[PDB]
Write a protein that binds this ligand. Sequence first.
Ligand SMILES: CC(C)C[C@H](N)C(=O)NS(=O)(=O)OC[C@H]1O[C@@H](n2cnc3c(N)ncnc32)[C@H](O)[C@@H]1O
Ligand SMILES: [Zn+2]
Ligand SMILES: [Zn+2]
Length: 814
Amino acid sequence: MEKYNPHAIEAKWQRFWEEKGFMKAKDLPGGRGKQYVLVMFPYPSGDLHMGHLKNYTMGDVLARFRRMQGYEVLHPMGWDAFGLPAENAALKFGVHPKDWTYANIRQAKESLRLMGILYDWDREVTTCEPEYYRWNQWIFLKMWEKGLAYRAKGLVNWCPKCQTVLANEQVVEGRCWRHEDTPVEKRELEQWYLRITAYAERLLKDLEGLNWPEKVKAMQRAWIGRSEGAEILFPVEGKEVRIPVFTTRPDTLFGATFLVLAPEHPLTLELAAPEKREEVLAYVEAAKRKTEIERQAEGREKTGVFLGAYALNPATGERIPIWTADYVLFGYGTGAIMAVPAHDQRDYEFARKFGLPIKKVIERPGEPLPEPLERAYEEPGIMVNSGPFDGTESEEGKRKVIAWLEEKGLGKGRVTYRLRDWLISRQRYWGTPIPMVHCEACGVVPVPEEELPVLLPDLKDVEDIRPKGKSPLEAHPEFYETTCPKCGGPAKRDTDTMDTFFDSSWYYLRYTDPHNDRLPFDPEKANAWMPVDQYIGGVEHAVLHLLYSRFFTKFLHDLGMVKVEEPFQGLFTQGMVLAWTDFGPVEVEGSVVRLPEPTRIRLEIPESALSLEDVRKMGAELRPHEDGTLHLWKPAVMSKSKGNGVMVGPFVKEQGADIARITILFAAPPENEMVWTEEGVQGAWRFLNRIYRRVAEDREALLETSGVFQAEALEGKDRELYGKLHETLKKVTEDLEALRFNTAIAALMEFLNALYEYRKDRPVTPVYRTAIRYYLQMLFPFAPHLAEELWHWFWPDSLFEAGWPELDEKALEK
Ligand SMILES: CC(C)C[C@H](N)C(=O)NS(=O)(=O)OC[C@H]1O[C@@H](n2cnc3c(N)ncnc32)[C@H](O)[C@@H]1O
Ligand SMILES: [Zn+2]
Ligand SMILES: [Zn+2]
C-alpha cells in the first residue's frame, strides 16, 4: 500500500485554489456576515522564515475556517516597503532600495504560496509606490489643517548608524529599534511632529473594552502615563504677582522650601532686588550663551543666584526664598518650580549646596526616613507635617490637595501624560516626501491636494542616497527648487521624509479599497469591512504600530471617514518561533561551566561562569562537538541576525507544506514561544502518514458505501462513534474560534485514534464514511493539501465548497 507523498500534490492544489479564487473578497460583504482576518504585513528586508510563517499560517487557518463557515472573508497581504527596514537592508549590501525591495517581495510571495497560504492578492499594497504614499501625503495635509501636524525645534533622539532622528517609541532601552547595539544620541533640530498627545485621554480610556492581551494594554497605559498634577500660585511678598508653578507632586506642597525660576523666566530679572540685579543679569546672560544640549546636561555642578525676593507658601503660609538656577528649564511647566529637597533628588542636591531648608512631608512606609536625610525620598508614602492631610497616602493626597487648592482659589488641577508628540520626519531618501513647501516670505506652506503626489526623485546612485547626516534630497535642487503655492515666488520643498510607521498606521484601511485614486479609501467600503475581527502580530509593536494605528483611526473617525474608533477589535500576539543555536565552546569543571569571551559575547550575558543548573534553567544544553570540545546550544529567536532561520523553499522541497504547518501549529499554544525541532517535524509526518493510511486502507470500501444514515437508528460502536464525532467537531470549532490551534490538532489526533479503534470492530459504514467526510473538513484549515487530495478520492467539489460540518447538540447529551 502506498504512503503519503507531499510532492506534486501541494503544487497542484495551490494552483487550483488560486485559479478558483476561493479567497477573493467582495467589495461589499453580502448580508451573511463578514470576517476581517489580518496579519501584520512584513518589511521586505530579507527572506521569510518559519517564524514569519507561524504568524501567517495562523492567519490562513482562521481565514480558511471562517470561509468554510460561510462568512465573506477579507484576508489580505501587502508590503511595508518604505522606511528604515527596507533601506537599511538594501544599503548593507550596497543595493538600490527599489531593486532590493521588489526582489524581496517576489521571494516572499513564493514562500507564502508554497506554504498553501491564500490571500486576496487583488488587494495587495506596496507602500513605496506613489499609488499608496500619495495618500500618506493626503492624510498628512488633513492633520496639518486640523492642528495635528507641526514643525518645532528642540532636542531629539538620533542614531549615528541610521543617520537620522528617531521617534521616542523607536528607542528601546536607550538603543535604536533597528540597531540594538547602538546607543541613541541627542541633537537639536527642527522637525515635524504629529500631535498624538491630543488623543492621549481617548487612547487610554478606549483600551478598557478592547479584546486585547492584558500585557499589551498594560504597556500602552504605562507608555501614555496619565499623571495627576497641579498649577499652584505663590504670592510674592510685597508684589501683586502670584507666581504660577506646575508640579506633578502637589502632595509635597507643605515641603516646598523655596522656588526656582528658569533664567529666562520674565520674573527672574523683574523680581531681582536692586543690589542683586547685576549678578542676576550676568547669570541670565551666561545661561543663554549655552546650547540646549549644554543646559540639558547632567553631571554639571549646581549653580544659581538668590533673587533677593520671597514668596509665600500657600499651604504653610510661610516665607520662602526665590532663586533662579540653570537646572530649571523654562520649557518645563511654567518655567518655575517649587523645590522640595526632601522628596526630589535634584532639589536635594541644590538645597544641600546652597544651605536651603529640607523638610519632610512624605514618610516612608515601614522604617521611617532618618534624620538627617542623606538623600531625597521620591517614592509614595504617608503625608506628614502637612496639616489636615496628615495620614493620607501620597497618591490619594495629590487629589485631596488639588481639591483643596481649587476650593480655596490657590491653584488648579492639571493632568499631564508621559506620552510625547510623535516625531515623524526623517533625514532619509527611501520614504514618503512631506507635502510642504518653505517660502521665504510666506513661511511654511502646504502643497495643494490636487498636486499630490509629491514624487520621490528617482535617484539611481546608491552612494548618493546613503545617509551622511542630512537628507539625501538636500543635494537635489531639481527636486526641492519649486514655487510657493501661496504667493507664487521661489520656494523650497521640504526635504525630509515620513517614517515607515506612518505608512503602516492605516494600511489595513487601504486593503478595503486598494485601487481608489480619489481618496485613501471610500468610507462605505471601509465601514463594511471594519473593524479587523482578528489581528495577529508580534508584541514588539505594543507602543509602536499598535499605538500609532489607534491614533490614525481615531483621527480618520473624527474626519468622518471611519465609523469605528478602534481599528482592531481583536488582537492576538503570537509567541516567537525559536531555533536551537550553537553559541560556541565551553569548558566544564565540576558544577561550573567556563565561558570563553567569544561564547559569552554571542550569548550576550555578563557571566563568564555558569553552573550546570544555570545552563539548564536558561534552556541550554552542552553538546559534544567534532572539534573535540563541548559547545553550548540554546533556543534563540529565529531571525537573520542569529543565522538560525529555517527558510520555506528548502524545507518544503525536502519535506512539505502541510508538514511545516502541523509542526508549527501543534508545537504549543500560539501565544507561547515554540522551538522548531526535528522531533516536531517527525511528529507532523507521523500524523499525516496516519491520516493517509486510514483513508487509503478503506478507500475501496468507502467508494461502495453511501454516507446517508439515521442517527437515532445507530447502535453500539456506531452510536459511540457518532457521539465522538460531534464531541470532536464542537472542540475543534471552539478551539479555532479562540485560536487554540494546537489543542484543535490534538482533538483531531484523538479522534483519528477513535477511527482506528472503531475499525477494529466495525466495517466501513455510512456513519463511518460521514466521519471521514467531517474529518477532512475539520482538517482543511490545518493541512489543506492533504485534506483536498483525499477529499477528491470520494467527492466532486473542493473543500471550500463543502462548508463547515453542522454540530448535532443532541449527540453531545450523555
Ligand atoms: C504592521 C507592521 C508595522 C509590521 C512590520 N512591517 C513588521 O513587524 N514586520 S516584520 O519584521 O517582517 O514581521 C512580520 C511579522 O512576523 C512576526 N515574526 C517575525 N519573526 C518571528 C518569529 N521568529 N516568530 C514569530 N513571529 C515572528 C512579527 O512579530 C510580525 O508579526
Ligand atoms: Zn539605527
Ligand atoms: Zn510664498
